[PDB]
Amino acid sequence: RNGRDSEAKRLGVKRFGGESVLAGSIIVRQRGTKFHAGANVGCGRDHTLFAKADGKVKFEVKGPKNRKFISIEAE
Amino acid sequence: PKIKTVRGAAKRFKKTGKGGFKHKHANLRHILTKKATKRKRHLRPKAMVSKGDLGLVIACLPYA
Amino acid sequence: GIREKIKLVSSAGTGHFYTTTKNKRTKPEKLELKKFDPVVRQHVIYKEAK
Amino acid sequence: GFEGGQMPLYRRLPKFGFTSRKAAITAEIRLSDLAKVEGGVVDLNTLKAANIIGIQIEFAKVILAGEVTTPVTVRGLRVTKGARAAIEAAGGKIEE
RNA sequence: CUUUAAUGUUUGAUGUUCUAACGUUGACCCGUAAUCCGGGUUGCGGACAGUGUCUGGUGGGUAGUUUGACUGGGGCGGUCUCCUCCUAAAGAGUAACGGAGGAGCACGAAGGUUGGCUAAUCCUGGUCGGACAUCAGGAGGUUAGUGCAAUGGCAUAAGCCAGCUUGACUGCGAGCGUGACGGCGCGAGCAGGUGCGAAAGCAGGUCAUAGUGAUCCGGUGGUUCUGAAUGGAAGGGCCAUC
RNA sequence: AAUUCCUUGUCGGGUAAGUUCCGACCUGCACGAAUGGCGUAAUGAUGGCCAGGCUGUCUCCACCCGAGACUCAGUGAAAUUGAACUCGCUGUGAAGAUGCAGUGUACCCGCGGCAAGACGGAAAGACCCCGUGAACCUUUACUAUAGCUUGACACUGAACAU
RNA sequence: GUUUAUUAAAAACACAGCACUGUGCAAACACGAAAGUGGACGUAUACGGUGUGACGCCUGCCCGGUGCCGGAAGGUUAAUU
RNA sequence: GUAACGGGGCUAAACCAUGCACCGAAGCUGCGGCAGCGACGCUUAUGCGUUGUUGGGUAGGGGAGCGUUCUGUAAGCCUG
RNA sequence: AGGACCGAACCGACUAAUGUUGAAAAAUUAGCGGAUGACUUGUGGCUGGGGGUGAAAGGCCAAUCAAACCGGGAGAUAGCU
RNA sequence: UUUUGUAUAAUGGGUCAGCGACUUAUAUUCUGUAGCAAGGUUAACCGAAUAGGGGAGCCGAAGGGAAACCGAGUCUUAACU
RNA sequence: CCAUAGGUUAAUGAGGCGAACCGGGGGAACUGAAACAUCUAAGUACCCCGAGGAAAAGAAAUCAACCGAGAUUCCCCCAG
Ligand SMILES: [Mg+2]
Ligand SMILES: [Mg+2]
Ligand SMILES: [Mg+2]
Ligand SMILES: [Mg+2]
Ligand SMILES: [Mg+2]
Ligand SMILES: [Mg+2]
Ligand SMILES: [Mg+2]
Ligand SMILES: [Mg+2]
Ligand SMILES: [Mg+2]
Ligand SMILES: [Mg+2]
Ligand SMILES: [Mg+2]
Ligand SMILES: [Mg+2]
Ligand SMILES: [Mg+2]
Ligand SMILES: [Mg+2]
Ligand SMILES: [Mg+2]
Ligand SMILES: [Mg+2]
Ligand SMILES: [Mg+2]
Ligand SMILES: [Mg+2]
Ligand SMILES: [Mg+2]
Ligand SMILES: [Mg+2]
Ligand SMILES: [Mg+2]
Ligand SMILES: [Mg+2]
Ligand SMILES: [Mg+2]
Ligand SMILES: [Mg+2]
Ligand SMILES: [Mg+2]
Ligand SMILES: [Mg+2]
Ligand SMILES: [Mg+2]
Ligand SMILES: [Mg+2]
Ligand SMILES: [Mg+2]
Ligand SMILES: [Mg+2]
Ligand SMILES: [Mg+2]
Ligand SMILES: [Mg+2]
Ligand SMILES: [Mg+2]
Ligand SMILES: [Mg+2]
Ligand SMILES: [Mg+2]
Ligand SMILES: [Mg+2]
Ligand SMILES: [Mg+2]
Ligand SMILES: [Mg+2]
Ligand SMILES: [Mg+2]
Ligand SMILES: [Mg+2]
Ligand SMILES: [Mg+2]
Ligand SMILES: [Mg+2]
Ligand SMILES: [Mg+2]
Ligand SMILES: [Mg+2]
Ligand SMILES: [Mg+2]
Ligand SMILES: [Mg+2]
Ligand SMILES: [Mg+2]
Ligand SMILES: [Mg+2]
Ligand SMILES: [Mg+2]
Ligand SMILES: [Mg+2]
Ligand SMILES: [Mg+2]
Ligand SMILES: [Mg+2]
Ligand SMILES: [Mg+2]
Ligand SMILES: [Mg+2]
Ligand SMILES: [Mg+2]
Ligand SMILES: [Mg+2]
Ligand SMILES: [Mg+2]
């Protein structure tokens, strides 16, 4: 009664801090907004964060909830 | 004697200019209505055979 | 499952149709929606629900 | 093509297209070939005499491959734009 | 030309009768000093029977074969695809007949957009009122809610309400991701046309992650691409869908 | 019970002692009426049990007569066999050692005997599994099919009546 | 009486008897693409098949299933047209 | 069959600490030698006074060779 | 009279021992069964391989049988050793 | 030899000698090497026969497109940043 | 009754053997498809009839494509 499992989704961070990404580059695969989208980051339908601009991945904590945000700083 | 082309492969692939092979995509024959428009559109153009499979195709298509 | 496949048919005489699904036991009326027809290239009323 | 019993690629993928019987009786001609005929004229039939095109080719087309350095008359053939200009730039007389 | 009686008359069924086909493993004659054969005469049946071609049924009488894999041996049982958590050793991935639960959908609104709202639970008091309906305040602060498992998310709400609507658009797609491959997924932006909104803008389906099936063979509609002399057509291709 | 799992069922007989046997009981796991049921004289190289007689079957062997075995002469095989200067023990180790380790014992070579070991010889295990092996066999497995059967047409015609 | 020649002789096979069923003769049935041949130079007190298996007392209920026999208004139904 | 230090035997030849010496391998070094892969000055179809490093190996891949019979070279060369 | 009785030839083969590179690819020794019958035996003949024949054991069909032997397809195929 | 692993009490071999297993043909591709080179090369056949002739053909110098068709561009789309 | 079957004789010819090739009449399965039935193997093997030095085939009721070719057979291409 206990022999089933789902194929693993390969979620998580694909581009880490300071990593130079081109526009379109997926940054995080996630279930929900564990990370939220910041400057030049789009949040897709599956809530994956992707880059809208070429530049450098920047993780940051912001706001009154101390939520985790990702932005691209143009180098 | 002459190698016999695998006739079924001759009907699914065509040799490109730099020796590659173009093929029609799978999953667009039927059951089209549950599939997103976007998925169907990317399946409409011919893709190229990947590296792992060019050996199989070339083996099957010697006179290509 | 229960829900059945239908074709939404363009009133522009093009022959273009969309495809979708409908529950027939509930909402037994004809699904009429404005949709883009790519032969005349305008939004157009589509009509059918089987 | 046997992949261990997995549905192999040649059958996993769909068939496409048809074969046109016209393509087999249709040949491209390079500008380099227009000098290989005897007499300056380039008809479908004098191209066969020069072994440029097959004996069963009914339709012939001159394309912009190579160069023509000669006044050449092309008759009953088709000519690309780029090819039409290279012929005309050398004393060319294309005749439909 | 509407209608409607008849027969030479065409073929339909049934019934009766016939004989000339056909049969005869009845008698008799000859070939022939032959229980075969044939012919002959005769009787008996007789358009039957019987055989051929076609056809439905029956048909282990006979034939060719199939009758799965995983598996702390095999078999019985259970399992086989997909989703969630744990195992999983703080990137991903990671096995067992390891531990635990779900899916094989639903929705023309439960989708898009504009505008608006914010729970559970307990406390106090109050008509029928119970320990719990509805009302008011208070404390509470999401301990709720999410069309359905679990996880991660969710107040700028993704949760509740209403108005207008069809972006559940078509063609494309920088670039990424994930896969041995097949493939799957994310995607700004462009063109065209639309909806919402005063506007910025948002909208290429639904909070997301399951809700599925390659190719072949066909079917349907579209498309004068092809069309075996030629014009067509058939069929094929291409597009959409089954 | 040629059928009974439980089961050496219960009781009784027979024996000093009887899982068998006989008889009866019924609680027939799971008899039963021509795939016969119940009996049944006779018959049986049939199965089971009892007794008399008999005996080396046995207690428990002993002796004897002969054919071999042993010795001489003559003839003269065989299976097997990687090579062998081929010991015990304890341990180790593809996990049960003549061959490794340690130790102990042992002068070299025969002959007659015995069979504990050489996982001895013999047969590419016959059980068990596997192979998308095989063969026969079964059937309301699949697909066919001889045969049987149905009808249409042909061989096959004439009339009469409705 | 028979049997596994060469590990089984038996409770197995057979058996007389019994029954069921088929068979009207160019018999059923069987060997045979066929002709023919057996059955049988027999003819239902016969022949073939099946089962039981001397003899004795007997052989009970069940025809829903499967077959077999029969019946036939209706429905379904092939080639053909 | 001692058979629970491998044995002999050991009261250290045991154990703990504190040290200095030795033994100990196909490891390292030393001498001589072969080969592979590089990189180097003269100079060159390069090979070296040179230099550096490598060189266990199944499946398996790569490279270079030995020998055998026959054909040509060969009516030649060796050989009673 | 008798598929009657005892018992030799004859036909068979229940037990035991021997032998198991045997004297023998199934026998020998002692015993055992049938022994006027459904007996046994000689000569010749017929039946042929999915076929025969079978008082039925899948028994036998030239020391070979759940499909004989010989030749051929044929170097079947062998994801195995 | 086979294996995770064999002195293994796992397999094979009594010994010697002799024989005994990646071939051949045709296609195709890659490498090396040679020839010619935007051209290369001929097949059958003829025969002045390993010559020479034979260029029928094959490959290559252009691709894109399902195809018509277009062509250094083409396809896609009404049209492409 | 005619006749016909049937009878006797004469003359002519055949009969059987043989390697392959040839034409015709019948016709497998293993195998391959990684199972198997369509399909494959293959009109192969095999059986049978008949012929000849070769046999068969053969002088368009053929192709072609609006230009034309001009019986059959065999070879190389077309083309896997
Ligand atoms: Mg389609
Ligand atoms: Mg030519
Ligand atoms: Mg069968
Ligand atoms: Mg078969
Ligand atoms: Mg299995
Ligand atoms: Mg992880
Ligand atoms: Mg980790
Ligand atoms: Mg737009
Ligand atoms: Mg959801
Ligand atoms: Mg069409
Ligand atoms: Mg036509
Ligand atoms: Mg036409
Ligand atoms: Mg006693
Ligand atoms: Mg006793
Ligand atoms: Mg019974
Ligand atoms: Mg008795
Ligand atoms: Mg002697
Ligand atoms: Mg010997
Ligand atoms: Mg020792
Ligand atoms: Mg001795
Ligand atoms: Mg042994
Ligand atoms: Mg074995
Ligand atoms: Mg056999
Ligand atoms: Mg008897
Ligand atoms: Mg026996
Ligand atoms: Mg016996
Ligand atoms: Mg009986
Ligand atoms: Mg009885
Ligand atoms: Mg009936
Ligand atoms: Mg002791
Ligand atoms: Mg010390
Ligand atoms: Mg040393
Ligand atoms: Mg060293
Ligand atoms: Mg040195
Ligand atoms: Mg080495
Ligand atoms: Mg080393
Ligand atoms: Mg007697
Ligand atoms: Mg007697
Ligand atoms: Mg005698
Ligand atoms: Mg004797
Ligand atoms: Mg005797
Ligand atoms: Mg007697
Ligand atoms: Mg049996
Ligand atoms: Mg025999
Ligand atoms: Mg032969
Ligand atoms: Mg073989
Ligand atoms: Mg063969
Ligand atoms: Mg092993
Ligand atoms: Mg092992
Ligand atoms: Mg070892
Ligand atoms: Mg040994
Ligand atoms: Mg062994
Ligand atoms: Mg050994
Ligand atoms: Mg051996
Ligand atoms: Mg077959
Ligand atoms: Mg097969
Ligand atoms: Mg076939």
Side-chain angles (χ1 to χ4, degrees):
Chain A
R1 276 188 47 88
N2 299 320
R4 289 151 316 277
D5 193 52
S6 68
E7 189 65 29
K9 287 307 138 101
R10 290 97 191 212
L11 297 177
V13 169
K14 309 306 189 173
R15 293 280 146 239
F16 288 85
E19 194 164 4
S20 63
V21 289
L22 279 170
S25 294
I26 285 161
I27 302 153
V28 205
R29 309 272 318 297
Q30 41 172 12
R31 296 286 85 119
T33 43
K34 201 169 160 201
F35 305 101
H36 290 261
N40 306 306
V41 175
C43 190
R45 65 170 300 270
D46 60 345
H47 297 314
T48 200
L49 309 183
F50 63 100
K52 289 155 105 179
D54 306 335
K56 281 194 330 199
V57 175
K58 178 51 155 35
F59 288 78
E60 45 185 7
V61 179
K62 288 179 76 184
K65 295 168 210 77
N66 317 280
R67 290 208 174 152
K68 325 199 167 167
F69 279 81
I70 317 185
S71 47
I72 289 95
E73 299 223 328
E75 163 48 44
Chain B
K2 292 185 193 193
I3 299 162
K4 295 240 187 164
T5 286
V6 173
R7 297 308 274 149
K11 280 172 188 147
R12 266 92 169 188
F13 307 103
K14 199 184 147 186
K15 200 186 202 187
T16 63
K18 300 297 289 292
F21 280 98
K22 75 175 183 178
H23 72 90
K24 180 162 158 67
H25 269 281
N27 312 342
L28 206 73
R29 276 308 205 209
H30 78 342
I31 310 172
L32 309 166
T33 194
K34 50 165 72 163
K35 293 174 185 137
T37 169
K38 177 218 206 176
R39 189 181 159 194
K40 268 115 89 170
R41 192 180 50 250
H42 290 99
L43 291 172
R44 190 167 42 242
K46 273 76 177 182
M48 290 294 280
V49 178
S50 65
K51 179 169 104 85
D53 301 318
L54 270 171
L56 303 155
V57 173
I58 283 159
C60 288
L61 297 169
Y63 294 92
Chain C
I2 293 143
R3 154 177 306 254
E4 226 156 62
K5 301 189 261 272
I6 54 152
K7 81 156 59 168
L8 294 166
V9 180
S10 195
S11 307
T14 68
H16 183 272
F17 60 96
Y18 281 76
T19 318
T20 193
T21 44
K22 188 187 73 173
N23 194 348
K24 196 197 64 47
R25 286 194 289 207
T26 79
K27 316 266 202 318
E29 61 271 26
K30 297 279 144 162
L31 189 60
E32 186 191 31
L33 299 150
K34 296 219 202 195
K35 284 260 168 56
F36 186 71
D37 192 310
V39 187
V40 65
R41 289 171 65 210
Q42 312 301 328
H43 273 67
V44 158
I45 308 94
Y46 284 56
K47 283 188 282 261
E48 159 170 319
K50 290 282 156 39
Chain D
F2 189 74
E3 304 186 3
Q6 184 177 275
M7 172 44 56
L9 191 71
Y10 65 100
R11 284 161 45 111
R12 186 188 331 161
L13 294 177
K15 289 195 273 177
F16 67 85
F18 76 103
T19 310
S20 34
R21 316 196 48 256
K22 251 178 113 103
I25 54 153
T26 305
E28 68 198 43
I29 298 88
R30 306 173 95 277
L31 301 164
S32 314
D33 302 334
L34 304 169
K36 298 224 178 62
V37 312
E38 184 57 284
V41 70
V42 176
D43 181 37
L44 188 72
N45 80 331
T46 198
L47 283 168
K48 285 168 197 204
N51 210 355
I52 309 311
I53 62 165
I55 294 173
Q56 301 293 92
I57 299 298
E58 299 178 20
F59 315 107
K61 195 162 184 186
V62 190
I63 77 168
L64 189 52
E67 293 112 317
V68 46
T69 78
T70 40
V72 159
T73 293
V74 180
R75 243 167 237 151
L77 264 62
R78 274 181 291 188
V79 174
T80 61
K81 190 170 101 169
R84 185 176 255 272
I87 298 157
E88 282 190 341
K93 184 176 183 287
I94 298 161
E95 301 298 313
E96 80 197 6

